[PDB]
Design a protein around this ligand. Structure first.
Ligand SMILES: N[C@@H](CCC(=O)N[C@@H](CS)C(=O)NCC(=O)O)C(=O)O
Ligand SMILES: [Cl-]
Ligand SMILES: [Cl-]
Ligand SMILES: [Cl-]
Ligand SMILES: [Cl-]
Ligand SMILES: [Cl-]
Length: 140
């Protein structure tokens, strides 16, 4: 991971509507960035916490930006349907996966961080109830 206070590096992927959507698109909002893939069990198990958080704060200048490294688009879509994880979900193009992971120095998954409205990383290692409580702290 990167140090808190770091500027979050650029990310672009393709969303479920077939459009390119970047982290920069959410400037002005707090954004939980969730790096994951379908075969990451613990990533999937965070879903209820992510949904609870998304629902509580989505009207107050907050969103979730999910970023998958799935090699297969089918696996990614199946997971989203199974999890009902219908926030902003993008899939990295193959040629971008290594660059994104290196830029965020991602070693392990899940990797869930909180980015502020100016694009600075303000929290990391977010899991479970701590995820909700951390977002509450920054958004409220
Ligand atoms: N601007 C940083 C970006 C690279 C970076 O942050 N690397 C990771 C390790 S791959 C790091 O040192 N992270 C510190 C942390 O996560 O606290 C640098 O060049 O050192
Ligand atoms: Cl930085
Ligand atoms: Cl970006
Ligand atoms: Cl989407
Ligand atoms: Cl990491
Ligand atoms: Cl993390």
């Amino acid at each position: 991971s990167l140090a808190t206070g770091s500027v979050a590096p650029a990310i672009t992927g393709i969303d479920l509507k077939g459009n390119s959507v970047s982290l920069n698109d959410f400037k002005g909002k707090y954004v939980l960035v969730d790096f994951w893939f379908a075969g990451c069990s613990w990533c999937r198990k965070e879903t209820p916490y992510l949904l609870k958080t998304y629902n509580a704060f989505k009207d107050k200048g907050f969103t979730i930006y999910g970023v998958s490294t799935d090699r297969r688009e089918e696996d990614w879509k199946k997971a989203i349907e199974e999890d009902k994880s219908y926030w902003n979900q993008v899939l990295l193009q193959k040629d971008d996966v290594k660059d994104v992971l290196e830029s965020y120095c991602i070693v392990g998954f899940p990797h869930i961080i909180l980015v502020d409205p100016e694009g600075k990383i303000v929290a990391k290692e977010l899991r479970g109830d701590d995820l909700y409580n951390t977002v509450e702290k920054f958004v409220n």
